[PDB]
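Lab notebook, page 48
Experiment: co-folding of the full assembly
Goal: obtain a model of how the components sit together before planning crosslinking
Operator: M.T.
Materials (sequences as entered):
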Amino acid sequence: FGTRKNSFIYNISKKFSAITGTYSDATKRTIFAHISHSINIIDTSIPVSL
Amino acid sequence: RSNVFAVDSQIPTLYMPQYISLSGVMTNDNQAIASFEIRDQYITALNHLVLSLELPEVKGMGRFGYVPYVGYKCINHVSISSCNGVIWEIEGEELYNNCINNTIALKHSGYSSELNDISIGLTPNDTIKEPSTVYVYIKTPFDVEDTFSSLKLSDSKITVTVTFNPVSDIVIRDSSFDFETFNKEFVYVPELSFIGYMVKNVQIKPSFIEKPRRVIGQINQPTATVTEVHAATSLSVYTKPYYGNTDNKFISYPGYSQDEKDYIDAYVSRLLDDLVIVSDGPPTGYPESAEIVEVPEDGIVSIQDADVYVKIDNVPDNMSVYLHTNLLMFGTRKNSFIYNISKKFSAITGTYSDATKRTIFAHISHSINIIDTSIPVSLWTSQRNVYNGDNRSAESKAKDLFINDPFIKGIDFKNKTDIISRLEVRFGNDVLYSENGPISRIYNELLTKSNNGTRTLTFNFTPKIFFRPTTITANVSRGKDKLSVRVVYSTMDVNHPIYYVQKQLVVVCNDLYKVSYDQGVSITKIM
Amino acid sequence: FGTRKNSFIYNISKKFSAITGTYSDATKRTIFAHISHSINIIDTSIPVSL
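Observation: model returned without errors.
Model output:
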C-alpha cells in the first residue's frame, strides 16, 4: 500500500524474518514448521477491499 | 437517611478456634470401615472436615495410574452419628456432585501428572509411584454460613464413619499388572481433622438440615418411585451405565488431559498405529476375517460409499502402504446397515520414520464422537454380532485397560450426549411437570454456576440459613405423598452398538429434617 | 535527512520546481532570475548541526 510512488510503503512480506520448513513430495506442497514474525491483530483485521 | 459511610461494630461471642487432628480405628463384604470418636469437654462446635489418605509406594511391571480425583472417588459412604442415632450421612456420588463446582477442592483431591499419567515399569523392582498424600474435603450442610451454621456438640460424643470403596474402583491397570498381590497388600490409612471452637457461654437454638436420599430403579426400567415424601426441596434425575454383564475393558483413557478433544486424540492415536501399516508383503498377525487392501499409486481408496485419502511420506521403495478397511464392524442382519469404524476417516497423512520403523502421523480428518471412545470392547465381540468383529493385533489387545470408575453418568465419560428425550413427574395422580428440552438443566446450571448440572426441579429460592427453606408439602389426606418419575429414552439406530448398553434411572430426593438439642443431638422427620 | 536507509527522506532539493536565469561571462557566475518554490520558515530555521 502506498499513496505516492516513492514514499513509505506498508509491505506485508517485510514482516517476516525467518522461514524454515520441509517440502512434501507425496502431496506436492510445503509443510511449514517454525516461523518468526511481528504480525499484530490489525493486519489480520484489514478488510480485503481496502 | 441511612448512613452508608459508617457502621457500629458489634462485639462477637468470645471464642478461640483450633485445628484438631485425630487418628482412626480401622475395622472390617470385606469393605474397610474407619471409626473416629470425638470426645473433649472444651470443644463446643466443629465444621470443615478433611480426610487425609497415605497412598503407598507401588512397584512392579505393567501400566498403572490413578483415576482423577482419587480422594473423592474412594468414598462410598459417610455417616456422622451420636448416641441417639444418625445425624447426617451421604453417598459418595451425592458428595462428589456437591463438590464438583469447587476447583480448589478438586485440585487438592489429587489431580496432577504425577498421579494421573499412565506410567510404565520395565523391571520387577522399578518404582512406579512415589508415596504421596491426598486430601478429601467432606463438604457438609454445616458450612454455608461459617460459625452461624456449625454443628453444636451439646456435651455428647460424636462418631464419624467412613466406608471405603474397594481399591479396584480407583485404579486403572492393564492385564500385565499383578492386581491380586497389590490388592492383598494395599491398606487404607485415614486421618480426620476439623476446626473446633472454644465458646464461652454459648446460646444454642434449633436449626434446619437437609439429608439427600437416593433411590435406584431396576435395570432398563423407565420408571422410579420415591416413597415417604413430606417436604422435599428438590428432585434430580440422571442415568448411570451398568457394566455388570461385561469385563469392564476399554480401548483408551487420556489420563491427566481431560478435554473432549484429548479423549478423541487418544482414541485416534490408539487406532492409527493399527489402521495404516507399512509392510513388505501382506501384513501378518491378523485374524483371517480382516480385509486389508493395498492403496493405489493415485492415493485414493474407495470403500463402498466412503472415500479415504491416504498419503504417507518418506516410504521406502521396497515397501507398500496397506489400509485396514474393517477394523471394527457391527451388524444385526446380514445385508442391512453396517456400523464400520474404518468409514469414519476421510484423510490420513504422515511421514515414515526409518529409525523406529513406524509411522508418525501429521494431519488427520475424522468424525469420531465420544461414543466411539466410550464403547466397551466386550460389546464388539458379543454373541449378537453376526460378524467376527475385532481384527486388531494381539499386541494391541494387550493394551486395554480395566476401568471400574463408580461415578460415570450418561453413556459416555463426559455426559455430553443427552439420551433422555422426555421427562414426566407425577405427584399423586396429577402431572406436576413435563418437558421436552433440557430447560431444567439450563436452570440448574445458571443457578449453581456449574458445568456438570443435572435435570433438577428446585423448589427453594429463599436465602439460606436466615430463612426456613420453602418446601412442597404432602397432602396425605388427598393421597399426594409420592413422587413418580417416568422418562422416554431417545430412539437410537439398531445397528449402533450403544443400543445395547444397559441403563439405570437414578432419582435423588432432598428431604428436610429438623435438628433439636433437647438433651443431646437429635433429628426428627418433618411431617 | 533519514533514519533508515530506504524510508521517507526529507530532501531540500525536491522543494524546487522551476529555476530560470542568465549566466554572466564577465563575473564567471550565474545570476538567477525568477524562482518558484514551497520553502517555509522552518527550513530556514533549522540549525546546521542537526
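Interpretation: The two ends of chain C are 9 Å apart (CA to CA).
Next step: discuss with group before ordering constructs.
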